[PDB]
Amino acid sequence: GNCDVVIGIVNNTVYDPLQPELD
């Protein structure tokens, strides 16, 4: 989904640890 439908929402960054792994 996109952040244009959900009734209650917040802003935080999903880490996806692989970026660290790649570098």
Next chain:
Amino acid sequence: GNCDVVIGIVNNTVYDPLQPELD
């Protein structure tokens, strides 16, 4: 497994998110 063992399996491409970032 190996592709031969399963029945009705269809040739297709599976995409990996990690490879693009690495390159």
